[PDB]
Amino acid sequence: MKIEEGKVVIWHAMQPNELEVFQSLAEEYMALCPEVEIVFEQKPNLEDALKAAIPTGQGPDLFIWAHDWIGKFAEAGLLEPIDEYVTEDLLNEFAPMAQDAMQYKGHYYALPFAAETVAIIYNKEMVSEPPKTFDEMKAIMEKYYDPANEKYGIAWPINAYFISAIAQAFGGYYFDDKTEQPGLDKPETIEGFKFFFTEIWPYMAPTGDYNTQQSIFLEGRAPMMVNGPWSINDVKKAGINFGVVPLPPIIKDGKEYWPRPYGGVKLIYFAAGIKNKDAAWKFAKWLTTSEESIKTLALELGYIPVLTKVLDDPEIKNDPVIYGFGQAVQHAYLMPKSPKMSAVWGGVDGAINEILQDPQNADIEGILKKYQQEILNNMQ
Ligand SMILES: OC[C@H]1O[C@H](O[C@H]2[C@H](O)[C@@H](O)[C@@H](O[C@H]3[C@H](O)[C@@H](O)[C@H](O)O[C@@H]3CO)O[C@@H]2CO)[C@H](O)[C@@H](O)[C@@H]1O
Numbered sequence: 001m002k003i004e005e006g007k008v009v010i011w012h013a014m015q016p017n018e019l020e021v022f023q024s025l026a027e028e029y030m031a032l033c034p035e036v037e038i039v040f041e042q043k044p045n046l047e048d049a050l051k052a053a054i055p056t057g058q059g060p061d062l063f064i065w066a067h068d069w070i071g072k073f074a075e076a077g078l079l080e081p082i083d084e085y086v087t088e089d090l091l092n093e094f095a096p097m098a099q100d101a102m103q104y105k106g107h108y109y110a111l112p113f114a115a116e117t118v119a120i121i122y123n124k125e126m127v128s129e130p131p132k133t134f135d136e137m138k139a140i141m142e143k144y145y146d147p148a149n150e151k152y153g154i155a156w157p158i159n160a161y162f163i164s165a166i167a168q169a170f171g172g173y174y175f176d177d178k179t180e181q182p183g184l185d186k187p188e189t190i191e192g193f194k195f196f197f198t199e200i201w202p203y204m205a206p207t208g209d210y211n212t213q214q215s216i217f218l219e220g221r222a223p224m225m226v227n228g229p230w231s232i233n234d235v236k237k238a239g240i241n242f243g244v245v246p247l248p249p250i251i252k253d254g255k256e257y258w259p260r261p262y263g264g265v266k267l268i269y270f271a272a273g274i275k276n277k278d279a280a281w282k283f284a285k286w287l288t289t290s291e292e293s294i295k296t297l298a299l300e301l302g303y304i305p306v307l308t309k310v311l312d313d314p315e316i317k318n319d320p321v322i323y324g325f326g327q328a329v330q331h332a333y334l335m336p337k338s339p340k341m342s343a344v345w346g347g348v349d350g351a352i353n354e355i356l357q358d359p360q361n362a363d364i365e366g367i368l369k370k371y372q373q374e375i376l377n378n379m380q
Pocket of ligand 1: 013014018066067068069116159160161162228230264345
């Protein structure tokens with residue numbers, strides 16, 4: 001007879017300030033179970049690192065990411081099924097979309113701990129009323145834009161997911177998960193991309209890089225940032241008094257066109273080749289179904305609980321940041337689990353790379369047509 005012993009190794013791509021929150025939870029857990037070491041290990045290119053290490057027996061026990069990898073990782077045999085651990089009682093602890101995010105074709109491979117998307121994070125010392133329409137957003141942008149003094153109207157990391165809200169504001173889509181077809185060359189999608197680079201890019205420092213954009217906001221050199229819960233401890237460490245609201249509707253002849261960001265469910269995944277399964281299960285189950293664990297992720301970072309019970313906690317119900325991300329998620333599209341999405345993301349990031357070579361003059365329509373076809377050829 002025995003106990004669970006040893007180590008649980010968890011790979012991730014969190015930056016240090018987000019990680020701190022997760023490490024303090026690990027430390028609590030290790031206080032609860034002194035015979036179990038929880039070890040977090042940062043990977044620059046986590047998806048690449050897992051693909052390479054998992055099959056060779058060099059991968060971790062667990063890893064953290066949004067849910068959309070679960071389809072392609074399972075098809076590649078890179079995950080460990082946990083069907084034997086999942087029960088209806090456990091499933092019923094989670095919101096249905098978290099219930100669905102944690103499985104692929106009938107097998108469970110993870111536990112869910114949050115919902116997320118990007119939203120406007122605004123600095124209350126620079127913006128006293130956040131924008132409820134794109135027009136008010138643009139006026140705030142105009143008010144603060146002053147590149148000569150290294151001041152910009154907004155901070156916004158640029159990549160497929162980060163600008164999907166705007167790309168998809170006018171009925172466009174990267175991918176229709178009904179028909180399972182990319183939508184890059186739909187006029188409404190083209191309209192959304194042009195809108196980003198015509199209406200919003202001119203107010204930015206002209207770089208798509210994540211930490212450069214974020215640092216502009218953290219340094220008070222932009223009044224607003226488009227980012228997710230994963231960035232919130234960075235905002236807090238910078239001493240900024242902030243709020244969170246959804247990207248507001250663009251108005252066209254009195255009509256609203258709501259930006260529609262992609263969003264997702266955060267999962268702790270079980271990796272194929274896992275060495276310490278029962279210990280890793282116990283930690284994950286704790287992390288995802290203990291009230292104080294989930295309350296801590298939500299109150300510290302703005303993560304929206306998918307642990308139903310805590311949604312009724314007054315601590316959670318009266319919290320501004322979780323409410324604002326929650327409002328943003330209401331307009332979000334849940335990322336598909338289809339492995340087809342892999343080439344979609346590649347196609348959209350490829351188009352953005354070419355647009356960024358010459359954003360003011362690029363032929364966005366023809367680029368998008370070009371990448372639609374590449375996606376159509378690489379989709380599987
Ligand atoms: O752009 C294509 C990718 O879009 C999706 O990735 C999203 C994540 O889903 C989302 O969580 C967010 O990731 C951040 C992560 O949460 C945080 O812990 C880490 O420290 O930083 C990440 C951002 O740099 O944003 C990315 C988009 O960058 C999708 O999940 C992924 O498969 C696509 O490749």
